[PDB]
Amino acid sequence: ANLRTQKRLAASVLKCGKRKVWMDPNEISEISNANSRQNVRKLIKDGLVIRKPNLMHSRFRIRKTHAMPSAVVWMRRQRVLRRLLRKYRESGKIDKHLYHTLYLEAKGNTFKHKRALIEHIQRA
Amino acid sequence: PRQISDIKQFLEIARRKDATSARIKKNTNKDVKFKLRCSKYLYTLVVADAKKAEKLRQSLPPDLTVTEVG
Amino acid sequence: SNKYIIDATAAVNDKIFDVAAFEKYLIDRIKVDGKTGNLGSSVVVSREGSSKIAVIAHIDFSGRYLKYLTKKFLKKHSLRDWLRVVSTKKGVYELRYY
Amino acid sequence: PSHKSFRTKQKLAKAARQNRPIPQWIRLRTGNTVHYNMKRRHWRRTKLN
RNA sequence: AAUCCGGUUAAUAUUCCGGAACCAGAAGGUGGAACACGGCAACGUAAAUGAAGUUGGAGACGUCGGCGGGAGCCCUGGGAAGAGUUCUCUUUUCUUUUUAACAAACCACACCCUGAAAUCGGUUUAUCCGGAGCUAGGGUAUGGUGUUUGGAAGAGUUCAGCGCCUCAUGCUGAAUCCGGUGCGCUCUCGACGGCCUUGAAAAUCCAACGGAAGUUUCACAUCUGGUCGUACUCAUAACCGCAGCAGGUCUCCAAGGUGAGCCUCUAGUUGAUAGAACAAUGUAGAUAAGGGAAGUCGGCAAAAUGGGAAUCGAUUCCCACUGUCCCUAUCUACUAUCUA
């Protein structure tokens, strides 16, 4: 017969889309008689109406095909130099008087890598 | 909902006339949760020992309605 | 450490595949670290009785891998449409009809 | 809209009752020219204004 | 001033149901409270009188930029369940893997105490602080925060099995776990740096000064919260255009890949009278041998990818390109043709 309302209710109780709602083709009479949501849930339990599973976006080939700001480099580099230079104070390698000068140079981008700052500590 | 840790106070809330029902919950870590429904707050008590779980159950006044695992 | 058991009572009753055949298939197709039969001492496969295949592994062992290995034999035997693999309990697998 | 006032709703209420079909028994009375409705409106057609 | 989650209907949901909270007003009873104390201090507490009068704050507010945090989405590993693949290799491929309002405790920009600095120290991503007190140590407070729990697994979800003429639609087992990652998208917050045009009103609430009169501003419990709107569309069909009109309309949420476009996931449509045959013509496109503006008032339009030099964007020149032309031919779709 006509099953617009049954499909709408089936999507409502399955919490899915009516495109994914699958309604059995050779039990039309019983499905048509099932008119209320209680009857629709009965059909769900008996398996007459099944929710089709989702499709896929195939990350498989997405991974297969898988396999710069000028400020951000200083953004992290300045952090590492300061965060290392701070622990050297607590470790006692450099006193506050020399650290003031060393931190002042570090602003001027005198070294480009953390090992470069380490050679200055070795020199001093 | 308040979490109550002192056993005696949970007894005295239970003895209070405002208390209406209590719920006993058995968790997977063998903790039992005494959930006492009051007017404003739901007072819960987690006691780790199974036997303190039991001597608490009948020390609750009989008039209060205890309920099994909710 | 972990124990993985695949019951074969239904297969034995239906005479689909014997426990000896299941053990031989497991030995010949155990892709442990990419090598067949390389289970060694970390993983030991000891089928107790002719109704199940049990493996005690001290390293990681995937139940999905065991199910996939079992399903591989089903495809060869052309009995996939007759039986499907299910997990009765954690670390436990079984074959049930449709 | 879904924010109508009471007076708007009441005016709508009787406008919905006005455009109803006429009972047959009043037609079946004698000397009663009433045999159809000449005040039948439709929402898609002429607005209530 | 104050509400969230799950479920329910053929049609209503922050409104109904079950559960868990909040706000406002109103009186009392019980217990504790006594014109109170402890901390040098940044303060704190269950209480800690305040008649009148006086006073302030919140409410009560522009714009840009960077930084860090959080939430959700996206990416991703291990594990678990289901589905796909298989002689071969693939511990594979795909789908799912959730925690609301509301509470409790704990838990760092501003301030203070000790301290008295230069040898100038601390210190922002973006050089500011300091003799108006530095570093350091110890506290103080706003504590979305998460650190656990309640809510709360009893919910929801994914599985497997059973119950049986049957409105039997209930019953039983599990799992719903452990992480990583960010110049990613959206929302939002805080210390800052700018642009200065320094940026509404009230109720209500709060606070202070104040000084008449010899157990609440505490906890629990109790009662009440009137009125109107609530369905549906928000449009290539529910509004406006005379109309089921190719038009016009305010606004929120917005996945992935390849790399602005194309393909998809979720979701939603398959809507617009249709069938047969490719006549002339027309429309929309493309290709064309040799020549290369010889066409036209003229490089209109395409191809060179449009460009080289001169004169005053225009003009000219040389080179370059091409169906404008010699000279038209061919191919496709639609219409026209026939039919209901």
XYZ file of C-alpha atoms (C1' of nucleotides) in Angstrom:
681
model
C 0.000 0.000 0.000
C 1.358 3.384 1.107
C 4.210 3.451 3.626
C 5.244 7.117 3.902
C 4.172 7.357 7.546
C 5.701 3.974 8.413
C 9.064 5.025 6.968
C 8.917 8.355 8.814
C 8.185 6.576 12.098
C 10.886 3.988 11.378
C 13.471 6.751 10.973
C 12.178 8.394 14.157
C 12.594 5.287 16.319
C 15.889 4.214 14.720
C 17.350 7.733 15.176
C 18.757 7.541 11.642
C 17.920 8.959 8.230
C 15.001 7.689 6.189
C 17.521 7.072 3.406
C 19.196 4.504 5.682
C 15.881 2.960 6.771
C 15.442 -0.411 5.062
C 11.883 -1.743 4.856
C 11.319 -5.364 3.904
C 9.839 -5.704 0.386
C 7.908 -8.983 0.822
C 6.161 -8.185 4.118
C 4.266 -5.119 2.910
C 0.979 -6.237 4.478
C 2.363 -6.622 8.008
C 4.421 -3.429 7.722
C 1.364 -1.491 6.534
C -0.722 -2.761 9.459
C 2.029 -1.641 11.854
C 0.920 1.982 12.198
C 1.977 3.237 15.646
C 5.489 3.562 17.036
C 4.928 0.601 19.366
C 4.174 -1.544 16.319
C 7.178 -0.040 14.520
C 9.467 -0.976 17.417
C 7.951 -4.457 17.195
C 9.017 -4.575 13.541
C 12.497 -3.383 14.543
C 12.823 -6.185 17.097
C 11.531 -8.812 14.653
C 13.992 -7.506 12.049
C 11.418 -6.580 9.401
C 12.825 -3.029 9.323
C 16.617 -2.743 9.548
C 18.816 0.351 9.764
C 21.343 0.247 6.938
C 24.913 0.780 8.205
C 26.952 3.840 7.311
C 29.281 4.147 4.328
C 32.949 5.063 4.466
C 35.230 7.889 3.396
C 38.075 5.403 2.809
C 40.928 6.980 4.763
C 42.952 4.061 3.324
C 43.783 5.861 0.074
C 43.662 9.148 1.998
C 46.599 7.872 4.055
C 48.207 6.421 0.914
C 48.106 9.794 -0.840
C 49.337 11.418 2.380
C 52.359 9.094 2.344
C 55.277 27.989 7.237
C 54.890 31.137 9.351
C 58.006 33.233 9.854
C 57.005 34.162 13.421
C 56.220 30.683 14.774
C 59.836 29.481 14.481
C 60.948 32.217 16.877
C 57.726 31.594 18.822
C 58.983 28.188 19.948
C 62.727 28.867 19.652
C 62.532 31.779 22.088
C 60.623 29.513 24.484
C 63.285 26.792 24.476
C 66.157 29.251 24.911
C 64.430 31.025 27.797
C 63.167 27.816 29.415
C 66.673 26.333 29.251
C 68.346 29.569 30.364
C 66.013 29.685 33.358
C 66.931 26.223 34.649
C 70.653 27.039 34.379
C 70.015 29.679 37.042
C 68.567 27.114 39.451
C 71.268 24.630 38.430
C 73.850 27.303 39.272
C 75.728 27.194 35.959
C 75.310 30.951 35.371
C 74.845 33.594 38.057
C 72.178 36.282 37.790
C 74.657 38.993 36.768
C 75.880 37.128 33.685
C 72.429 35.691 32.923
C 71.041 39.231 32.586
C 73.557 39.862 29.807
C 73.008 36.401 28.295
C 69.223 36.791 28.260
C 69.692 40.227 26.682
C 71.738 38.736 23.834
C 69.209 35.926 23.357
C 66.654 38.537 22.279
C 69.044 39.672 19.546
C 68.913 36.226 17.893
C 72.639 35.653 18.417
C 72.155 31.866 18.280
C 69.913 29.882 15.946
C 69.871 26.489 17.706
C 69.969 25.359 21.322
C 73.391 23.759 20.810
C 74.658 27.165 19.668
C 73.625 28.695 22.998
C 75.412 25.775 24.689
C 78.744 26.660 23.059
C 78.502 30.120 24.650
C 78.046 28.467 28.053
C 81.085 26.296 27.313
C 83.082 29.376 26.262
C 82.126 31.228 29.455
C 23.977 16.112 45.393
C 26.384 15.992 48.361
C 29.005 13.304 48.963
C 28.973 12.270 52.636
C 32.004 10.507 54.111
C 31.200 10.308 57.849
C 29.054 7.261 58.598
C 27.255 8.687 61.625
C 26.038 11.793 59.787
C 24.453 9.615 57.081
C 22.648 7.873 59.934
C 21.448 11.209 61.315
C 20.254 12.408 57.898
C 18.388 9.104 57.613
C 16.818 9.638 61.037
C 15.807 13.134 59.911
C 12.140 13.229 58.920
C 12.995 14.920 55.610
C 14.604 11.713 54.322
C 12.232 9.759 52.066
C 14.128 6.887 50.414
C 17.582 5.317 50.234
C 19.222 3.476 47.339
C 21.889 0.763 47.563
C 24.222 0.485 44.551
C 26.755 -2.291 43.894
C 29.645 -1.010 41.766
C 32.148 -3.091 39.800
C 34.937 -2.113 42.235
C 32.961 -3.740 45.113
C 31.932 -0.345 46.474
C 28.369 0.085 47.721
C 26.804 3.528 47.302
C 24.202 4.547 49.908
C 22.178 7.206 48.107
C 19.753 8.953 50.461
C 17.095 11.092 48.782
C 16.367 14.271 50.735
C 14.334 17.395 49.974
C 17.116 19.511 48.443
C 20.145 17.236 47.994
C 20.901 13.590 47.218
C 23.398 12.453 49.862
C 25.655 9.617 48.694
C 28.050 7.542 50.808
C 30.714 5.223 49.384
C 32.004 2.612 51.864
C 34.701 0.250 50.628
C 34.198 -2.803 52.881
C 31.426 -5.281 52.066
C 30.698 -5.922 55.735
C 30.351 -2.231 56.675
C 28.010 -2.280 53.691
C 25.899 -4.840 55.534
C 25.848 -3.568 59.127
C 24.813 -0.223 57.652
C 21.842 -1.747 55.818
C 19.764 -2.768 58.828
C 21.040 0.085 60.999
C 18.969 2.229 58.660
C 15.576 2.772 60.341
C 12.937 0.317 59.087
C 10.467 3.084 58.190
C 12.816 4.413 55.502
C 12.434 2.592 52.175
C 15.692 0.966 51.082
C 15.940 0.001 47.415
C 18.109 -2.634 45.762
C 20.523 -2.027 42.894
C 18.741 0.800 41.080
C 49.658 -13.923 30.299
C 46.524 -13.535 28.189
C 44.568 -16.658 27.247
C 42.699 -16.964 23.940
C 40.484 -20.012 23.371
C 38.545 -20.855 20.203
C 35.917 -23.524 20.830
C 35.528 -26.271 18.221
C 32.683 -28.288 19.768
C 30.221 -27.243 17.054
C 32.745 -27.968 14.294
C 33.527 -31.389 15.786
C 29.822 -32.224 16.085
C 29.145 -31.129 12.493
C 32.329 -32.868 11.232
C 33.354 -29.694 9.403
C 36.942 -29.549 10.685
C 38.694 -31.684 13.283
C 40.709 -30.309 16.189
C 43.859 -31.768 14.625
C 43.099 -29.899 11.395
C 42.517 -26.690 13.366
C 45.809 -27.136 15.231
C 47.676 -27.839 11.984
C 46.107 -24.790 10.324
C 47.031 -22.648 13.335
C 50.630 -23.909 13.291
C 50.987 -23.377 9.536
C 49.344 -19.923 9.544
C 50.353 -18.325 12.879
C 51.816 -15.056 11.561
C 53.408 -14.197 14.898
C 55.856 -11.363 14.136
C 55.494 -12.254 10.454
C 56.959 -15.762 10.833
C 55.014 -19.018 10.982
C 55.710 -21.052 14.106
C 57.738 -18.239 15.701
C 55.518 -18.142 18.803
C 58.358 -19.480 20.949
C 57.994 -19.223 24.715
C 56.135 -15.895 24.836
C 53.103 -17.477 23.129
C 52.313 -21.187 23.489
C 49.469 -22.922 21.640
C 48.249 -26.009 23.519
C 44.877 -27.419 22.450
C 43.444 -29.189 25.507
C 41.064 -31.875 24.284
C 39.548 -32.251 20.831
C 36.973 -29.505 21.361
C 38.941 -26.226 21.509
C 42.236 -24.540 20.650
C 43.877 -22.559 23.455
C 46.825 -20.159 23.267
C 48.568 -18.610 26.283
C 50.584 -15.561 25.223
C 52.878 -13.396 27.341
C 52.795 -10.738 24.591
C 50.064 -8.953 22.645
C 47.612 -11.199 20.793
C 44.568 -9.809 18.992
C 41.270 -11.659 19.184
C 40.370 -10.006 15.884
C 43.531 -11.527 14.404
C 42.465 -14.948 15.692
C 38.996 -14.431 14.209
C 40.529 -13.365 10.888
C 42.792 -16.429 10.884
C 39.800 -18.675 11.602
C 37.779 -16.974 8.858
C 40.658 -17.585 6.433
C 40.218 -21.347 6.820
C 36.446 -20.973 6.405
C 36.935 -19.299 3.020
C 39.203 -22.149 1.903
C 36.703 -24.748 3.146
C 33.847 -22.832 1.435
C 31.782 -23.112 4.638
C 31.571 -19.377 5.399
C 27.904 -19.245 4.370
C 27.177 -22.094 6.809
C 28.936 -20.792 9.935
C 30.119 -17.462 11.332
C 32.584 -16.614 14.095
C 31.252 -14.991 17.275
C 32.785 -13.947 20.598
C 30.963 -15.617 23.487
C 33.249 -13.977 26.064
C 36.463 -11.986 26.325
C 39.320 -14.056 24.952
C 36.789 -16.658 23.775
C 35.626 -17.375 20.223
C 33.162 -19.841 18.732
C 31.550 -20.822 15.436
C 27.762 -20.717 15.103
C 25.462 -21.431 12.177
C 23.032 -18.943 10.642
C 3.954 33.538 13.197
C 4.543 31.541 16.387
C 4.313 34.747 18.460
C 0.739 35.853 17.760
C -1.264 37.795 20.327
C -4.508 36.560 21.851
C -6.650 38.906 19.749
C -4.959 37.687 16.569
C -5.524 34.065 17.600
C -9.198 34.668 18.416
C -9.764 36.382 15.059
C -8.045 33.426 13.391
C -10.204 31.000 15.386
C -13.541 32.225 14.039
C -12.112 32.740 10.546
C -11.317 29.022 10.634
C -14.883 28.231 11.717
C -16.458 30.487 9.063
C -15.007 28.476 6.157
C -16.626 25.171 7.077
C -19.171 23.222 5.009
C -22.851 23.751 5.738
C -24.869 21.004 7.473
C -27.211 19.218 5.094
C -30.321 19.358 7.295
C -30.504 23.158 7.139
C -30.458 22.815 3.342
C -33.268 20.240 3.531
C -35.554 22.745 5.273
C -38.326 24.263 3.170
C -38.149 27.827 1.925
C -34.381 27.747 2.539
C -32.427 28.914 -0.510
C -29.176 27.986 1.278
C -27.733 25.098 -0.735
C -23.985 25.929 -0.756
C -21.445 28.317 0.769
C -20.625 31.695 -0.791
C -18.214 32.667 2.013
C -15.764 29.804 1.413
C -12.169 31.029 1.670
C -8.856 29.217 1.242
C -5.535 30.113 2.853
C -3.524 30.055 -0.384
C -6.252 32.229 -1.926
C -7.502 35.608 -0.640
C -5.844 36.653 2.622
C -7.820 37.501 5.746
C -6.108 40.921 5.830
C 15.622 36.481 39.160
C 15.557 30.851 37.966
C 16.276 23.476 33.935
C 19.175 19.795 32.548
C 19.354 14.450 30.924
C 16.698 10.132 29.057
C 12.008 8.475 27.305
C 7.090 9.129 25.365
C 2.831 10.889 20.516
C -0.039 9.555 14.057
C 0.718 14.822 15.161
C 3.774 18.555 21.714
C 8.288 19.088 24.046
C 14.133 22.757 27.708
C 6.355 22.582 28.528
C 4.136 15.797 29.099
C 6.529 11.292 31.883
C 10.830 9.315 35.302
C 15.055 11.225 37.569
C 18.106 15.176 39.259
C 18.433 20.838 40.373
C 17.696 26.129 40.464
C 15.220 31.194 41.461
C 11.824 34.561 44.021
C 8.376 35.621 47.910
C 6.186 34.319 52.684
C 5.821 33.039 57.679
C 7.161 30.038 61.647
C 9.317 25.330 64.718
C 13.871 22.559 66.245
C 19.151 22.762 66.960
C 23.350 25.774 67.095
C 24.327 30.895 67.796
C 25.250 35.721 72.477
C 25.613 44.383 70.532
C 31.821 37.910 68.533
C 36.432 36.353 67.651
C 41.350 34.124 65.545
C 45.582 35.819 61.870
C 51.378 41.598 62.752
C 49.429 41.212 57.376
C 47.730 40.558 52.280
C 42.365 38.087 55.751
C 38.993 34.430 57.378
C 34.113 32.091 59.960
C 27.452 28.705 60.646
C 26.230 32.798 63.676
C 29.236 37.822 64.418
C 22.233 43.905 66.604
C 22.026 48.164 63.272
C 16.206 53.349 63.902
C 16.782 57.437 60.856
C 19.974 60.010 57.838
C 24.575 60.350 54.473
C 27.605 57.775 50.504
C 29.713 54.501 46.544
C 29.941 50.062 43.324
C 28.012 46.293 40.330
C 24.450 46.170 36.935
C 26.506 49.894 32.984
C 29.086 48.411 27.638
C 33.913 51.307 21.473
C 37.819 49.015 17.648
C 42.364 46.248 16.032
C 46.582 42.738 16.801
C 49.437 38.958 19.022
C 49.876 35.258 22.920
C 48.272 31.183 26.168
C 44.023 28.016 28.151
C 39.385 25.394 27.532
C 35.184 23.157 24.900
C 33.262 20.763 20.412
C 34.624 19.211 15.280
C 38.890 17.052 12.378
C 43.501 13.807 12.339
C 45.667 9.319 14.932
C 47.854 4.719 17.879
C 46.803 0.287 21.122
C 42.431 -2.592 22.706
C 37.087 -4.546 22.316
C 32.444 -5.811 19.307
C 30.138 -6.256 14.460
C 30.591 -6.266 8.910
C 34.037 -6.812 3.983
C 38.479 -9.289 1.727
C 41.380 -13.902 1.199
C 45.714 -20.225 -2.202
C 49.334 -16.236 -1.837
C 51.171 -11.456 1.413
C 47.811 -8.191 4.753
C 48.223 -9.094 13.733
C 43.997 -6.249 7.338
C 39.743 -2.981 5.558
C 35.083 -0.418 7.175
C 31.435 0.931 11.148
C 30.785 1.950 16.781
C 33.420 2.890 21.255
C 29.004 8.724 25.080
C 28.739 11.552 30.237
C 24.015 17.386 30.721
C 22.318 21.062 34.130
C 23.493 21.280 39.014
C 26.952 20.419 43.937
C 31.199 19.326 47.023
C 36.093 19.822 48.398
C 40.758 20.415 47.019
C 43.889 23.139 43.545
C 47.962 29.869 39.729
C 47.022 37.972 37.105
C 46.613 41.368 41.737
C 48.140 42.376 46.880
C 50.960 41.887 51.467
C 54.860 40.192 55.088
C 60.535 39.141 55.783
C 63.871 41.223 52.751
C 66.831 45.997 51.198
C 68.997 46.028 45.400
C 73.636 48.499 41.209
C 78.148 44.325 40.057
C 71.928 47.146 38.034
C 68.715 42.649 38.646
C 64.021 40.370 37.168
C 61.623 39.849 32.713
C 57.217 39.890 27.569
C 56.110 36.088 21.393
C 55.568 41.735 20.996
C 61.461 45.790 26.842
C 58.424 46.807 30.757
C 59.021 46.872 35.902
C 61.914 48.670 40.671
C 64.287 53.548 45.754
C 56.695 54.758 44.246
C 61.137 48.773 46.274
C 64.583 44.306 42.906
C 65.601 39.013 43.268
C 64.233 35.352 46.471
C 61.042 32.821 50.322
C 56.159 32.574 52.604
C 50.874 33.740 52.289
C 46.406 36.289 50.590
C 41.833 36.362 46.387
C 38.420 36.051 41.640
C 39.611 29.261 40.978
C 35.627 28.375 33.326
C 39.479 25.445 35.277
C 40.748 19.614 35.899
C 42.219 16.640 40.533
C 37.977 12.690 42.178
C 32.876 11.746 43.314
C 27.691 12.666 43.273
C 24.178 13.263 39.082
C 25.562 8.215 36.631
C 24.794 3.720 34.360
C 20.012 2.398 36.834
C 20.724 6.277 31.011
C 21.931 5.855 25.909
C 24.656 2.759 22.384
C 26.872 -1.754 19.888
C 26.701 -6.969 20.167
C 25.033 -12.518 21.389
C 21.379 -15.679 23.289
C 16.668 -16.926 25.501
C 11.656 -16.430 26.675
C 6.550 -18.294 22.361
C -0.302 -19.834 18.763
C -0.025 -15.863 21.265
C -0.776 -7.520 23.067
C 5.682 -13.172 24.955
C 7.499 -7.810 24.350
C 9.709 -9.008 28.037
C 14.358 -11.837 30.032
C 19.672 -12.911 30.419
C 25.135 -12.211 29.436
C 29.073 -8.891 28.115
C 31.606 -4.258 26.178
C 30.908 0.876 25.999
C 38.574 0.922 27.519
C 43.831 3.019 27.473
C 46.279 7.289 24.865
C 48.628 10.740 21.322
C 48.680 15.014 18.325
C 47.547 21.156 16.270
C 50.610 27.720 12.395
C 44.092 22.754 11.599
C 38.096 24.835 11.804
C 34.196 27.069 15.164
C 32.951 29.255 19.907
C 35.010 31.399 24.128
C 38.182 33.118 28.006
C 42.619 35.699 30.625
C 47.083 38.387 31.309
C 48.988 42.293 27.375
C 50.237 45.509 23.182
C 48.162 49.055 20.140
C 43.792 52.561 17.475
C 41.152 56.886 21.214
C 36.894 57.773 19.410
C 37.597 57.455 26.894
C 32.643 54.887 24.966
C 23.419 54.356 26.829
C 18.979 54.044 30.899
C 16.349 51.681 35.017
C 14.780 48.255 38.350
C 17.063 45.267 41.592
C 21.107 43.829 44.492
C 25.370 44.892 47.380
C 28.644 47.749 50.361
C 30.426 51.788 53.551
C 29.898 56.139 57.014
C 26.362 56.549 60.494
C 24.531 56.024 66.118
C 17.955 55.515 68.597
C 16.802 51.306 71.247
C 18.506 46.941 76.698
C 20.111 34.664 68.513
C 20.033 36.347 62.306
C 22.616 38.239 57.630
C 23.024 30.337 60.585
C 21.192 25.164 59.324
C 17.096 22.082 58.335
C 11.988 21.725 57.372
C 6.910 23.911 55.019
C 3.750 26.572 51.308
C 3.159 29.169 46.695
C 4.562 30.909 41.921
C -1.016 33.936 38.171
C -1.439 35.572 32.456
C -0.726 35.163 26.992
C 2.384 32.732 22.686
C 3.955 27.408 21.912
C 1.282 22.790 15.714
C 3.357 23.865 10.672
C 6.292 26.506 6.224
C 10.479 30.198 6.516
C 10.171 28.777 0.433
C 12.524 26.769 -7.512
C 5.107 25.137 -3.582
C 2.845 27.284 2.852
C 5.588 35.023 2.973
C 5.674 39.067 -1.241
C 5.270 39.410 -6.506
C -2.885 38.353 -9.597
C -0.246 32.378 -9.872
C 2.087 25.816 -6.795
C 5.786 32.878 -10.895
C 13.540 30.606 -13.475
C 12.438 36.841 -9.130
C 12.908 39.000 -4.174
C 14.059 38.553 0.627
C 16.740 38.930 8.206
C 19.747 34.982 10.484
C 22.338 30.217 13.518
C 24.976 25.267 13.263
C 28.794 23.777 8.377
C 32.753 16.709 7.747
C 36.862 14.659 4.508
C 40.345 14.145 0.403
C 43.105 15.813 -3.860
C 44.590 20.376 -4.432
C 39.836 28.194 -6.177
C 37.580 24.127 -8.264
C 36.001 18.439 -8.657
C 34.800 13.771 -5.929
C 32.249 12.190 -2.038
C 30.469 11.065 4.217
C 25.837 12.429 7.362
C 21.325 14.317 5.746
C 17.839 15.233 1.582
C 15.951 14.830 -3.182
C 15.563 11.478 -8.280
C 11.825 17.337 -8.622
C 10.250 20.158 -13.743
C 4.305 16.150 -19.338
C 6.560 12.086 -21.808
C 7.761 8.556 -26.321
C 9.902 7.944 -31.236
C 13.339 9.878 -35.252
C 18.027 12.983 -35.826
C 14.933 16.896 -42.380
C 15.823 22.125 -43.567
C 16.670 26.448 -40.330
C 18.189 28.464 -35.644
C 20.795 28.347 -30.761
C 25.152 26.553 -27.896
C 29.694 24.717 -28.591
C 34.540 22.409 -30.782
C 38.265 20.637 -35.214
C 40.139 21.842 -39.870
C 44.826 20.903 -44.977
C 47.845 25.560 -47.780
C 47.793 30.905 -46.992
C 47.475 34.453 -42.437
C 43.363 40.162 -41.587
C 43.859 39.567 -48.298
C 37.157 40.350 -44.330
C 35.102 44.692 -42.321
C 34.506 51.779 -41.699
C 38.122 48.064 -38.029
C 42.047 42.148 -35.600
C 34.215 42.663 -33.866
C 35.020 37.558 -31.797
C 38.651 33.540 -31.075
C 44.520 31.998 -31.063
C 49.267 33.319 -29.792
C 50.172 33.963 -22.749
C 48.059 38.674 -25.905
C 53.904 41.445 -26.504
C 58.418 44.229 -28.652
C 59.801 49.197 -30.303
C 58.327 54.168 -31.376
C 54.672 58.973 -31.411
C 50.627 61.768 -28.763
C 45.263 55.009 -22.463
C 45.124 56.158 -28.016
C 47.809 55.583 -32.727
C 51.514 53.519 -35.869
C 55.230 50.034 -37.153
C 57.839 45.062 -37.354
C 57.493 40.322 -35.544
C 53.612 36.418 -33.516
C 48.819 34.015 -33.717
C 44.431 32.355 -35.637
C 38.043 29.802 -40.075
C 37.363 37.483 -40.069
C 38.472 35.653 -45.199
C 39.970 32.590 -49.832
C 35.904 28.522 -48.753
C 33.533 26.189 -46.728
C 33.410 21.039 -44.729
C 32.624 17.847 -40.453
C 31.034 16.444 -35.201
C 27.707 16.920 -30.508
C 23.387 18.728 -27.493
C 18.698 21.441 -27.681
C 14.793 23.294 -30.711
C 12.221 22.659 -34.953
C 9.471 17.071 -37.106
C 5.909 13.194 -35.766
C 3.061 11.102 -31.535
C -0.141 10.601 -26.419
